Amino acid sequence: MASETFEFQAEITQLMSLIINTVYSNKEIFLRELISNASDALDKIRYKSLSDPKQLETEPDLFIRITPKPEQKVLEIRDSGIGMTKAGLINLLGTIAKSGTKAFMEALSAGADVSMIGQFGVGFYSLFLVADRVQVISKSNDDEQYIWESNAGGSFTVTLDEVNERIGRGTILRLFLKDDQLEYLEEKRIKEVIKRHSEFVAYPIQLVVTKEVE
Amino acid sequence: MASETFEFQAEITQLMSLIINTVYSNKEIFLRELISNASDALDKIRYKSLSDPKQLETEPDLFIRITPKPEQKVLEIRDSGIGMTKAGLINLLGTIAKSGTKAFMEALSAGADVSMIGQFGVGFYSLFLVADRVQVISKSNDDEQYIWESNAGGSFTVTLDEVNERIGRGTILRLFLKDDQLEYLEEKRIKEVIKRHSEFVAYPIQLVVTKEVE
Ligand SMILES: COC1=C2C[C@H](C)C[C@H](OC)[C@H](O)[C@@H](C)/C=C(\C)[C@H](OC(N)=O)[C@@H](OC)/C=C\C=C(/C)C(=O)NC(=CC1=O)C2=O
Ligand SMILES: COC1=C2C[C@H](C)C[C@H](OC)[C@H](O)[C@@H](C)/C=C(\C)[C@H](OC(N)=O)[C@@H](OC)/C=C\C=C(/C)C(=O)NC(=CC1=O)C2=O
């Protein structure tokens, strides 16, 4: 339906500017970050299901799933983790000041490698190394499916989802890749980054490949 | 939103009963039929674009795409063809009597092989050889995305689509496969049926495969 618009916390806008603009080099670590967040969301739903097992029923399979959509120059990273509510997307992804946002920027400007970003708890923002636009589509058991959207600019939108496949539970990171970074649409490149930086993951990592029949 | 319910034309209910119940044997021809309908829908949008090229812009790529979803025991056949309107789904897929429906039943009962079903213009109904439920999800340039749904019973539903991925234009056949017929979730089996009965197709046939990264 209609979209609500929210302004970014000053520093989060700052951080997004550093990342999408400068940085360079170790760009491929965005995938380790997103997979690690997916893994954390999966840990969370699974831990919650220990004392409330009905939670797993909206989507009984625990997985991480990567889907290149070359036509749209899009890369999606999906998990059937715990998902986020409207309130969650609004507060934790923009309006409330992340503790480590300022400290990481200072660390960065002082010599720190971007790959450290995850230890400051703002690794989600690494996605702007390779993308200039993101939709975070999420479904918690405690709320409806919503779309959060940001182009790195000063504000983001949150919209009730009536346009995307129903996920039973969890989250899709829909990355609109930059033109210089289309290599992350390639199967071999994807397997390679995964093997190098994400060897220790408790959940299956699926790769969706589209092949033409001969 | 809310669902409108429609009764099937008597004979179409008859036909669906023959097919989902008896038949046996050459079940795999359902795929030749669906691919051929997809090809016809693609011919139609392409022919229409000859004198109105803006038509292709809702989805500039012409393709047929097969997606097994083993978790849900579902097989989807998609095309970016001309799609159908609400009016279309209601009239041509149920309420108005198909010319060849009765003649095919007589041919069938007289010895005719099911594979003939396409020459009687009711091949769409072959899908009930392998499925006991279908959603036909379609998007014409002249209307909104709708879901038509039937379980072979006497009536079907038509619903405004707010729950599925937006297709830009065209149609998805979402088959809920029977338990005896899960083989059509398998990549090798799919390639094999395609090669045997659908060698001459003017459009790319894509197969979406989900593989676990090691
Ligand atoms: C330790 O928890 C983590 C925190 C606190 C974070 C807000 C907790 C969050 O709300 C309470 C849920 O507990 C958790 C299930 C949601 C995810 C992991 C999402 O990812 C998904 N579901 O796949 C992630 O991205 C869409 C959301 C924001 C991530 C931030 C801004 C970041 O930069 N790094 C972080 C990574 C983390 O693991 C981070 O700050
Ligand atoms: C020659 O046109 C065909 C006819 C007339 C048919 C109603 C024409 C239709 O409306 C006017 C559109 O022109 C056409 C674009 C839509 C499709 C081919 C759909 O398939 C898709 N889009 O992928 C198909 O199935 C969802 C719709 C009903 C098919 C029937 C009941 C059948 O059993 N066989 C038929 C196969 C055909 O090719 C048939 O009767």
Short mmCIF file of C-alpha atoms and ligand atoms in Angstrom, two decimals:
data_model
loop_
_atom_site.label_atom_id
_atom_site.label_comp_id
_atom_site.label_asym_id
_atom_site.label_seq_id
_atom_site.Cartn_x
_atom_site.Cartn_y
_atom_site.Cartn_z
CA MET A 1 0.00 0.00 0.00
CA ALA A 2 1.22 3.52 0.94
CA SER A 3 4.81 4.12 2.08
CA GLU A 4 6.01 5.71 5.32
CA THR A 5 9.26 7.71 5.02
CA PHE A 6 11.87 8.00 7.79
CA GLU A 7 15.04 10.06 8.09
CA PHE A 8 18.34 8.31 8.87
CA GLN A 9 20.23 9.07 12.06
CA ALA A 10 22.97 11.56 11.08
CA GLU A 11 25.92 9.17 11.64
CA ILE A 12 24.29 6.23 9.83
CA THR A 13 24.03 8.50 6.79
CA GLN A 14 27.73 9.34 7.38
CA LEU A 15 28.71 5.67 7.54
CA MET A 16 26.74 4.87 4.37
CA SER A 17 28.60 7.64 2.56
CA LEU A 18 32.07 6.41 3.54
CA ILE A 19 31.21 2.88 2.44
CA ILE A 20 29.42 3.39 -0.88
CA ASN A 21 31.99 5.98 -1.95
CA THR A 22 35.51 5.30 -0.66
CA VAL A 23 36.54 1.84 0.64
CA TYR A 24 37.68 -0.09 -2.47
CA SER A 25 39.62 -3.38 -2.37
CA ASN A 26 38.17 -6.05 -0.09
CA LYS A 27 34.60 -5.54 -1.35
CA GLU A 28 33.68 -9.24 -1.33
CA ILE A 29 33.40 -9.26 2.47
CA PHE A 30 29.84 -7.93 2.23
CA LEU A 31 28.85 -11.56 1.62
CA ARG A 32 30.51 -12.86 4.78
CA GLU A 33 28.62 -10.15 6.72
CA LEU A 34 25.21 -10.94 5.20
CA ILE A 35 25.68 -14.67 5.62
CA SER A 36 26.77 -14.12 9.20
CA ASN A 37 23.65 -12.01 9.91
CA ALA A 38 21.54 -14.71 8.28
CA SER A 39 23.23 -17.26 10.51
CA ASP A 40 22.54 -15.10 13.57
CA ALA A 41 18.84 -14.82 12.61
CA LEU A 42 18.72 -18.57 12.17
CA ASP A 43 20.42 -19.12 15.60
CA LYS A 44 17.81 -16.82 17.12
CA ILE A 45 14.69 -18.54 15.73
CA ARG A 46 16.21 -21.92 16.60
CA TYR A 47 17.06 -20.87 20.18
CA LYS A 48 13.57 -19.40 20.56
CA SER A 49 12.07 -22.69 19.33
CA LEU A 50 13.66 -24.55 22.27
CA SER A 51 10.90 -23.31 24.58
CA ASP A 52 8.23 -22.47 21.99
CA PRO A 53 8.49 -24.98 19.09
CA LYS A 54 5.35 -23.73 17.32
CA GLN A 55 7.63 -20.94 16.11
CA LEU A 56 9.25 -23.11 13.43
CA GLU A 57 5.93 -23.96 11.75
CA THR A 58 5.67 -20.83 9.60
CA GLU A 59 8.74 -22.24 7.83
CA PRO A 60 10.08 -25.53 9.22
CA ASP A 61 13.27 -25.49 7.10
CA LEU A 62 16.34 -23.64 8.32
CA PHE A 63 18.45 -22.40 5.45
CA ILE A 64 20.39 -19.63 3.79
CA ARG A 65 19.70 -19.12 0.08
CA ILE A 66 21.52 -17.05 -2.50
CA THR A 67 19.70 -16.12 -5.74
CA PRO A 68 21.35 -14.21 -8.60
CA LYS A 69 18.84 -12.49 -10.91
CA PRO A 70 21.15 -11.28 -13.73
CA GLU A 71 18.28 -9.74 -15.70
CA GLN A 72 17.62 -7.20 -12.95
CA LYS A 73 21.26 -6.93 -11.90
CA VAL A 74 20.08 -8.15 -8.52
CA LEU A 75 21.51 -10.44 -5.83
CA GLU A 76 19.23 -11.81 -3.09
CA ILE A 77 20.36 -13.33 0.18
CA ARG A 78 17.59 -15.09 2.02
CA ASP A 79 17.28 -16.85 5.33
CA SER A 80 14.42 -18.49 7.15
CA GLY A 81 15.64 -16.89 10.38
CA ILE A 82 13.60 -15.00 12.99
CA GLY A 83 12.80 -12.01 10.73
CA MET A 84 12.07 -8.45 11.82
CA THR A 85 8.91 -6.48 12.61
CA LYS A 86 7.94 -3.10 11.21
CA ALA A 87 9.06 -1.58 14.53
CA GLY A 88 12.32 -3.52 14.22
CA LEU A 89 13.08 -2.42 10.66
CA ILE A 90 12.35 1.20 11.61
CA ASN A 91 14.43 1.38 14.81
CA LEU A 92 17.37 -1.00 14.28
CA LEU A 93 17.92 -0.21 10.59
CA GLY A 94 18.03 3.59 10.66
CA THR A 95 16.40 5.78 13.32
CA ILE A 96 18.12 4.66 16.53
CA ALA A 97 21.89 5.31 16.73
CA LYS A 98 23.93 2.10 16.45
CA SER A 99 26.50 1.96 19.26
CA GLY A 100 29.44 1.11 17.01
CA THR A 101 28.68 3.41 14.07
CA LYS A 102 30.90 6.30 15.14
CA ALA A 103 33.73 4.20 16.55
CA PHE A 104 34.00 2.18 13.34
CA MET A 105 34.24 5.30 11.20
CA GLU A 106 37.10 6.51 13.41
CA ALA A 107 38.75 3.10 13.24
CA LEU A 108 38.33 3.13 9.44
CA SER A 109 39.79 6.59 9.00
CA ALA A 110 42.73 5.58 11.20
CA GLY A 111 43.81 2.67 8.99
CA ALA A 112 41.35 -0.08 9.91
CA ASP A 113 40.35 -2.54 7.19
CA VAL A 114 36.66 -2.59 6.24
CA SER A 115 36.55 -6.30 7.05
CA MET A 116 36.55 -5.23 10.70
CA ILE A 117 33.08 -3.65 10.23
CA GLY A 118 31.35 -6.73 11.69
CA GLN A 119 33.15 -6.45 15.00
CA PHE A 120 31.63 -2.99 15.40
CA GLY A 121 28.15 -4.37 14.85
CA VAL A 122 27.38 -2.45 11.66
CA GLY A 123 28.35 -5.06 9.10
CA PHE A 124 24.90 -4.90 7.46
CA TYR A 125 26.10 -1.62 5.91
CA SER A 126 28.92 -3.41 4.02
CA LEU A 127 26.30 -4.22 1.36
CA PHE A 128 26.86 -0.71 -0.01
CA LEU A 129 30.34 -1.74 -1.12
CA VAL A 130 28.63 -3.55 -4.05
CA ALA A 131 25.07 -2.21 -4.16
CA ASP A 132 23.64 1.30 -4.52
CA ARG A 133 20.15 0.28 -3.42
CA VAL A 134 18.67 -2.38 -1.15
CA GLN A 135 15.29 -3.76 -0.23
CA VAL A 136 15.16 -5.65 3.04
CA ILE A 137 12.04 -7.76 2.94
CA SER A 138 11.19 -9.43 6.20
CA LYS A 139 8.55 -11.54 7.88
CA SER A 140 8.45 -12.05 11.64
CA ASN A 141 5.94 -14.39 13.25
CA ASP A 142 4.85 -11.36 15.22
CA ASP A 143 3.91 -9.08 12.30
CA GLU A 144 3.13 -8.75 8.57
CA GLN A 145 5.64 -8.83 5.70
CA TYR A 146 7.26 -5.40 5.20
CA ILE A 147 9.70 -3.87 2.74
CA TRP A 148 12.39 -1.49 4.01
CA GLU A 149 14.18 0.36 1.25
CA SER A 150 17.24 2.62 1.07
CA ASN A 151 19.42 4.08 -1.70
CA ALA A 152 22.18 5.15 0.73
CA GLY A 153 20.57 8.60 0.80
CA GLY A 154 19.41 10.39 3.94
CA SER A 155 16.06 8.60 4.26
CA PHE A 156 14.43 5.20 3.87
CA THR A 157 10.93 3.89 3.22
CA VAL A 158 8.96 1.17 5.00
CA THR A 159 6.01 -0.36 3.14
CA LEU A 160 3.48 -3.12 3.81
CA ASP A 161 4.44 -5.93 1.37
CA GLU A 162 1.84 -6.78 -1.24
CA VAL A 163 4.22 -7.24 -4.19
CA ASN A 164 6.70 -10.00 -3.33
CA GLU A 165 6.53 -13.77 -2.85
CA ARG A 166 5.32 -14.66 0.62
CA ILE A 167 8.16 -15.86 2.71
CA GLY A 168 6.78 -17.92 5.59
CA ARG A 169 9.33 -16.43 7.98
CA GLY A 170 12.64 -14.60 7.71
CA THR A 171 14.35 -12.10 5.50
CA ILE A 172 15.48 -11.32 1.99
CA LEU A 173 18.24 -8.93 1.25
CA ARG A 174 17.59 -7.74 -2.27
CA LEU A 175 20.75 -6.08 -3.56
CA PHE A 176 20.68 -3.88 -6.64
CA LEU A 177 24.31 -4.30 -7.65
CA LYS A 178 26.43 -1.48 -9.06
CA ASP A 179 27.62 -1.82 -12.66
CA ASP A 180 31.26 -2.34 -11.68
CA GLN A 181 30.26 -5.18 -9.38
CA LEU A 182 28.21 -7.53 -11.58
CA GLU A 183 30.63 -10.39 -10.96
CA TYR A 184 28.63 -11.29 -7.87
CA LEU A 185 25.95 -12.55 -10.22
CA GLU A 186 28.36 -15.34 -11.28
CA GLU A 187 28.04 -18.84 -9.77
CA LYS A 188 31.76 -19.61 -9.62
CA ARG A 189 32.61 -16.26 -8.02
CA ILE A 190 29.85 -16.79 -5.43
CA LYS A 191 31.07 -20.29 -4.44
CA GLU A 192 34.57 -18.88 -4.13
CA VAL A 193 33.76 -16.01 -1.75
CA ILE A 194 31.66 -18.39 0.34
CA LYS A 195 34.47 -20.97 0.65
CA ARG A 196 37.08 -18.32 1.50
CA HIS A 197 35.15 -16.43 4.23
CA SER A 198 32.21 -18.57 5.38
CA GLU A 199 33.53 -22.14 5.92
CA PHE A 200 32.01 -22.49 9.37
CA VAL A 201 28.23 -22.16 9.03
CA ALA A 202 25.75 -24.43 10.84
CA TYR A 203 23.08 -24.06 8.15
CA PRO A 204 22.90 -25.15 4.53
CA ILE A 205 23.86 -22.46 2.08
CA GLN A 206 21.84 -22.93 -1.13
CA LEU A 207 22.67 -21.38 -4.49
CA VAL A 208 19.89 -20.97 -7.03
CA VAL A 209 21.12 -21.36 -10.56
CA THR A 210 19.16 -20.76 -13.75
CA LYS A 211 20.32 -22.89 -16.67
CA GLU A 212 19.05 -23.10 -20.24
CA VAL A 213 18.03 -26.56 -21.37
CA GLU A 214 19.70 -27.77 -24.57
CA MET B 1 -8.03 -9.69 -0.98
CA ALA B 2 -11.42 -11.50 -1.02
CA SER B 3 -12.05 -14.44 -3.39
CA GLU B 4 -14.80 -14.80 -5.98
CA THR B 5 -16.04 -18.38 -6.51
CA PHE B 6 -17.27 -19.77 -9.85
CA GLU B 7 -18.84 -23.07 -10.81
CA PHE B 8 -17.28 -25.16 -13.59
CA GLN B 9 -19.20 -25.90 -16.78
CA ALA B 10 -20.61 -29.42 -16.34
CA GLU B 11 -18.43 -31.08 -19.02
CA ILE B 12 -15.19 -29.40 -17.87
CA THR B 13 -15.82 -30.98 -14.46
CA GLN B 14 -16.40 -34.27 -16.35
CA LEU B 15 -13.13 -33.94 -18.26
CA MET B 16 -11.19 -33.12 -15.08
CA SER B 17 -12.58 -36.27 -13.47
CA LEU B 18 -11.54 -38.59 -16.30
CA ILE B 19 -8.03 -37.14 -16.30
CA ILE B 20 -7.16 -36.93 -12.60
CA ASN B 21 -8.64 -40.38 -11.97
CA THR B 22 -8.22 -42.79 -14.89
CA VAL B 23 -5.66 -42.16 -17.68
CA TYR B 24 -2.40 -43.71 -16.38
CA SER B 25 0.68 -44.37 -18.55
CA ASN B 26 1.80 -41.43 -20.69
CA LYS B 27 1.52 -38.91 -17.84
CA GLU B 28 4.66 -36.96 -18.78
CA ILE B 29 2.90 -35.33 -21.74
CA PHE B 30 1.42 -32.69 -19.42
CA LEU B 31 4.77 -30.92 -19.78
CA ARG B 32 4.65 -30.83 -23.58
CA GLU B 33 1.16 -29.30 -23.29
CA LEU B 34 2.15 -26.62 -20.78
CA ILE B 35 5.30 -25.72 -22.69
CA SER B 36 3.29 -25.55 -25.89
CA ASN B 37 0.73 -23.21 -24.26
CA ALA B 38 3.62 -21.11 -22.95
CA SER B 39 5.03 -21.00 -26.46
CA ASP B 40 1.64 -19.95 -27.83
CA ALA B 41 1.40 -17.13 -25.25
CA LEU B 42 4.89 -16.03 -26.21
CA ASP B 43 3.99 -16.11 -29.96
CA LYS B 44 0.96 -13.97 -29.15
CA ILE B 45 2.75 -11.20 -27.21
CA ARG B 46 5.50 -11.18 -29.84
CA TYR B 47 3.03 -10.95 -32.76
CA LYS B 48 1.15 -8.20 -30.93
CA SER B 49 4.43 -6.32 -30.42
CA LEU B 50 4.90 -6.08 -34.22
CA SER B 51 2.41 -3.19 -34.36
CA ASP B 52 2.56 -2.04 -30.74
CA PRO B 53 6.14 -2.55 -29.41
CA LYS B 54 5.48 -0.82 -26.08
CA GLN B 55 3.86 -4.12 -25.14
CA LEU B 56 7.19 -5.84 -24.51
CA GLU B 57 8.32 -3.27 -21.92
CA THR B 58 6.53 -4.79 -18.92
CA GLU B 59 8.94 -7.70 -19.41
CA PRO B 60 11.36 -7.36 -22.36
CA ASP B 61 12.68 -10.94 -22.09
CA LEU B 62 10.85 -13.77 -23.83
CA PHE B 63 11.32 -17.05 -22.03
CA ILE B 64 9.88 -20.22 -20.57
CA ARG B 65 11.07 -21.11 -17.06
CA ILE B 66 10.64 -24.28 -15.05
CA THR B 67 11.10 -24.14 -11.26
CA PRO B 68 10.93 -27.22 -9.01
CA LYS B 69 10.19 -26.38 -5.36
CA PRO B 70 10.70 -29.81 -3.70
CA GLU B 71 9.92 -28.47 -0.22
CA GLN B 72 6.34 -27.67 -1.23
CA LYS B 73 6.05 -30.58 -3.65
CA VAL B 74 5.42 -27.94 -6.29
CA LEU B 75 6.36 -27.51 -9.96
CA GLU B 76 6.04 -24.09 -11.62
CA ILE B 77 6.00 -23.44 -15.34
CA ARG B 78 6.37 -19.79 -16.20
CA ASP B 79 6.35 -17.78 -19.38
CA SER B 80 6.62 -14.09 -20.12
CA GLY B 81 3.88 -14.48 -22.73
CA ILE B 82 0.77 -12.33 -23.21
CA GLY B 83 -0.91 -13.36 -19.93
CA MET B 84 -4.63 -13.41 -19.18
CA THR B 85 -7.10 -10.95 -17.65
CA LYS B 86 -9.54 -11.65 -14.84
CA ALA B 87 -12.28 -11.90 -17.49
CA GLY B 88 -10.05 -14.29 -19.45
CA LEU B 89 -9.28 -16.58 -16.52
CA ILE B 90 -12.99 -16.70 -15.63
CA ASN B 91 -14.38 -17.43 -19.12
CA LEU B 92 -11.70 -19.48 -20.91
CA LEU B 93 -10.63 -21.55 -17.89
CA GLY B 94 -13.99 -22.78 -16.62
CA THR B 95 -17.33 -21.06 -17.22
CA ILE B 96 -17.62 -21.06 -21.02
CA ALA B 97 -17.84 -24.50 -22.68
CA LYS B 98 -14.66 -25.41 -24.56
CA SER B 99 -15.53 -26.61 -28.08
CA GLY B 100 -13.39 -29.75 -27.92
CA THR B 101 -14.16 -30.86 -24.35
CA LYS B 102 -16.93 -33.31 -25.19
CA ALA B 103 -15.40 -34.64 -28.40
CA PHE B 104 -12.11 -35.43 -26.66
CA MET B 105 -13.85 -37.37 -23.91
CA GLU B 106 -15.59 -39.46 -26.58
CA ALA B 107 -12.31 -39.92 -28.44
CA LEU B 108 -10.65 -40.94 -25.15
CA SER B 109 -13.31 -43.45 -24.21
CA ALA B 110 -13.09 -44.92 -27.72
CA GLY B 111 -9.38 -45.78 -27.49
CA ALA B 112 -7.68 -42.43 -28.09
CA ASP B 113 -4.38 -41.79 -26.32
CA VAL B 114 -4.33 -38.88 -23.87
CA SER B 115 -1.45 -37.34 -25.82
CA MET B 116 -4.08 -36.35 -28.38
CA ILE B 117 -5.66 -33.95 -25.84
CA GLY B 118 -3.83 -30.95 -27.34
CA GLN B 119 -5.38 -31.42 -30.75
CA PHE B 120 -8.79 -31.01 -29.11
CA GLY B 121 -7.73 -27.71 -27.57
CA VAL B 122 -8.04 -28.78 -23.93
CA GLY B 123 -4.45 -29.77 -23.25
CA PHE B 124 -4.24 -27.37 -20.27
CA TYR B 125 -6.27 -30.00 -18.38
CA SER B 126 -3.49 -32.62 -18.80
CA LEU B 127 -1.86 -31.03 -15.74
CA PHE B 128 -4.26 -33.10 -13.61
CA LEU B 129 -2.43 -36.25 -14.69
CA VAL B 130 0.32 -35.25 -12.19
CA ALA B 131 -1.23 -32.57 -9.96
CA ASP B 132 -4.32 -32.52 -7.74
CA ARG B 133 -4.34 -28.74 -7.39
CA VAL B 134 -3.22 -25.80 -9.51
CA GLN B 135 -2.83 -22.07 -9.20
CA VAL B 136 -2.69 -20.18 -12.48
CA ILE B 137 -1.15 -16.83 -11.72
CA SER B 138 -1.28 -14.39 -14.58
CA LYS B 139 -0.51 -10.80 -15.48
CA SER B 140 -1.81 -9.19 -18.67
CA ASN B 141 -0.79 -5.68 -19.67
CA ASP B 142 -4.49 -4.93 -19.66
CA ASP B 143 -5.26 -5.87 -16.03
CA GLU B 144 -3.92 -6.64 -12.53
CA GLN B 145 -2.23 -9.87 -11.40
CA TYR B 146 -4.83 -12.52 -10.50
CA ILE B 147 -4.75 -16.03 -9.07
CA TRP B 148 -7.12 -18.67 -10.47
CA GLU B 149 -7.26 -21.82 -8.39
CA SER B 150 -8.81 -25.27 -8.83
CA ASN B 151 -8.56 -28.64 -7.07
CA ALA B 152 -10.30 -30.52 -9.92
CA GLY B 153 -13.55 -30.13 -7.99
CA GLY B 154 -16.71 -28.52 -9.34
CA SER B 155 -15.68 -24.91 -8.71
CA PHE B 156 -12.69 -22.58 -8.87
CA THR B 157 -11.66 -19.33 -7.21
CA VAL B 158 -10.32 -16.12 -8.73
CA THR B 159 -8.46 -13.73 -6.42
CA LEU B 160 -6.63 -10.41 -6.80
CA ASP B 161 -2.93 -11.28 -6.28
CA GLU B 162 -1.28 -9.67 -3.28
CA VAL B 163 0.76 -12.69 -2.16
CA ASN B 164 3.09 -13.71 -5.00
CA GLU B 165 6.16 -12.23 -6.67
CA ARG B 166 5.20 -9.64 -9.26
CA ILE B 167 5.63 -11.01 -12.69
CA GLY B 168 5.95 -8.11 -15.14
CA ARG B 169 3.83 -9.95 -17.71
CA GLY B 170 2.74 -13.52 -18.34
CA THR B 171 1.76 -16.60 -16.44
CA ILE B 172 2.82 -19.10 -13.83
CA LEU B 173 1.39 -22.54 -13.64
CA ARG B 174 1.89 -23.61 -10.05
CA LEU B 175 1.39 -27.36 -9.87
CA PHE B 176 0.87 -29.09 -6.54
CA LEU B 177 2.13 -32.52 -7.55
CA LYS B 178 0.55 -35.77 -6.37
CA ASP B 179 2.64 -38.02 -4.12
CA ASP B 180 3.08 -40.71 -6.78
CA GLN B 181 4.40 -38.11 -9.21
CA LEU B 182 7.24 -36.39 -7.34
CA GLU B 183 9.75 -37.42 -9.99
CA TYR B 184 8.88 -34.26 -11.90
CA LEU B 185 10.76 -32.36 -9.22
CA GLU B 186 13.99 -34.01 -10.48
CA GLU B 187 16.33 -32.11 -12.82
CA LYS B 188 17.38 -35.09 -14.95
CA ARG B 189 13.79 -36.28 -15.42
CA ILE B 190 12.74 -32.75 -16.44
CA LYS B 191 15.51 -32.39 -19.07
CA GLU B 192 14.54 -35.79 -20.42
CA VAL B 193 10.82 -35.10 -20.93
CA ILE B 194 11.71 -31.76 -22.52
CA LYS B 195 14.16 -33.33 -25.00
CA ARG B 196 11.74 -36.13 -25.94
CA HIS B 197 8.59 -34.02 -26.57
CA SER B 198 9.60 -30.36 -26.92
CA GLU B 199 12.64 -30.23 -29.26
CA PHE B 200 11.19 -27.53 -31.48
CA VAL B 201 10.60 -24.43 -29.35
CA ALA B 202 11.47 -20.89 -30.49
CA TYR B 203 12.08 -19.63 -26.94
CA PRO B 204 14.69 -20.45 -24.33
CA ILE B 205 13.56 -23.02 -21.81
CA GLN B 206 15.22 -22.25 -18.45
CA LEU B 207 15.50 -24.68 -15.55
CA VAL B 208 15.98 -23.29 -12.07
CA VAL B 209 18.11 -25.53 -9.92
CA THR B 210 18.81 -25.15 -6.21
CA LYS B 211 22.17 -26.58 -5.15
CA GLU B 212 23.85 -26.69 -1.75
CA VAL B 213 27.30 -25.14 -1.63
CA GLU B 214 30.03 -27.40 -0.24
C1 LIG C 1 23.43 -9.67 17.20
O1 LIG C 1 22.37 -9.31 16.31
C2 LIG C 1 22.92 -8.41 15.35
C3 LIG C 1 22.85 -6.95 15.55
C4 LIG C 1 21.67 -6.38 16.35
C5 LIG C 1 20.46 -6.50 15.42
C6 LIG C 1 19.76 -5.13 15.33
C7 LIG C 1 19.50 -7.58 15.94
C8 LIG C 1 18.23 -7.64 15.08
O2 LIG C 1 17.18 -6.81 15.61
C9 LIG C 1 17.12 -6.95 17.03
C10 LIG C 1 17.76 -9.10 15.13
O3 LIG C 1 18.15 -9.61 16.42
C11 LIG C 1 18.46 -9.92 14.03
C12 LIG C 1 17.74 -11.28 13.97
C13 LIG C 1 18.31 -9.29 12.63
C14 LIG C 1 19.40 -9.42 11.65
C15 LIG C 1 20.70 -10.14 12.04
C16 LIG C 1 19.25 -8.83 10.25
O4 LIG C 1 19.80 -9.71 9.28
C17 LIG C 1 18.95 -10.81 8.99
N1 LIG C 1 17.73 -11.02 9.75
O5 LIG C 1 19.26 -11.59 8.12
C18 LIG C 1 20.07 -7.55 10.13
O6 LIG C 1 20.13 -7.15 8.75
C19 LIG C 1 18.84 -7.09 8.13
C20 LIG C 1 19.40 -6.47 10.97
C21 LIG C 1 20.24 -5.33 11.33
C22 LIG C 1 21.75 -5.57 11.40
C23 LIG C 1 22.64 -4.47 11.80
C24 LIG C 1 22.12 -3.02 11.83
C25 LIG C 1 24.13 -4.72 11.59
O7 LIG C 1 24.79 -3.98 10.91
N2 LIG C 1 24.78 -5.86 12.21
C26 LIG C 1 24.15 -6.67 13.24
C27 LIG C 1 24.20 -8.12 13.07
C28 LIG C 1 23.59 -9.02 14.13
O8 LIG C 1 23.62 -10.21 13.99
C29 LIG C 1 23.49 -6.05 14.48
O9 LIG C 1 23.45 -4.86 14.60
C1 LIG C 2 -4.71 -21.08 -29.22
O1 LIG C 2 -4.74 -20.59 -27.88
C2 LIG C 2 -5.02 -21.69 -27.02
C3 LIG C 2 -6.40 -22.01 -26.62
C4 LIG C 2 -7.42 -20.85 -26.52
C5 LIG C 2 -7.03 -20.09 -25.25
C6 LIG C 2 -8.27 -19.93 -24.36
C7 LIG C 2 -6.43 -18.73 -25.63
C8 LIG C 2 -6.12 -17.90 -24.37
O2 LIG C 2 -7.22 -17.04 -24.01
C9 LIG C 2 -7.76 -16.43 -25.18
C10 LIG C 2 -4.92 -17.02 -24.72
O3 LIG C 2 -5.02 -16.75 -26.12
C11 LIG C 2 -3.61 -17.79 -24.44
C12 LIG C 2 -2.47 -16.76 -24.56
C13 LIG C 2 -3.53 -18.36 -23.02
C14 LIG C 2 -2.85 -19.63 -22.78
C15 LIG C 2 -2.24 -20.41 -23.95
C16 LIG C 2 -2.74 -20.18 -21.35
O4 LIG C 2 -1.45 -20.75 -21.14
C17 LIG C 2 -0.45 -19.77 -20.92
N1 LIG C 2 -0.75 -18.36 -21.05
O5 LIG C 2 0.67 -20.12 -20.63
C18 LIG C 2 -3.70 -21.35 -21.17
O6 LIG C 2 -3.41 -22.02 -19.94
C19 LIG C 2 -3.34 -21.13 -18.82
C20 LIG C 2 -5.13 -20.79 -21.15
C21 LIG C 2 -6.19 -21.74 -21.41
C22 LIG C 2 -5.83 -22.97 -22.25
C23 LIG C 2 -6.88 -23.94 -22.59
C24 LIG C 2 -8.23 -23.92 -21.84
C25 LIG C 2 -6.40 -25.26 -23.20
O7 LIG C 2 -6.65 -26.31 -22.69
N2 LIG C 2 -5.60 -25.25 -24.41
C26 LIG C 2 -5.43 -24.08 -25.26
C27 LIG C 2 -4.08 -23.73 -25.66
C28 LIG C 2 -3.84 -22.54 -26.57
O8 LIG C 2 -2.73 -22.25 -26.91
C29 LIG C 2 -6.63 -23.24 -25.73
O9 LIG C 2 -7.73 -23.52 -25.37
#
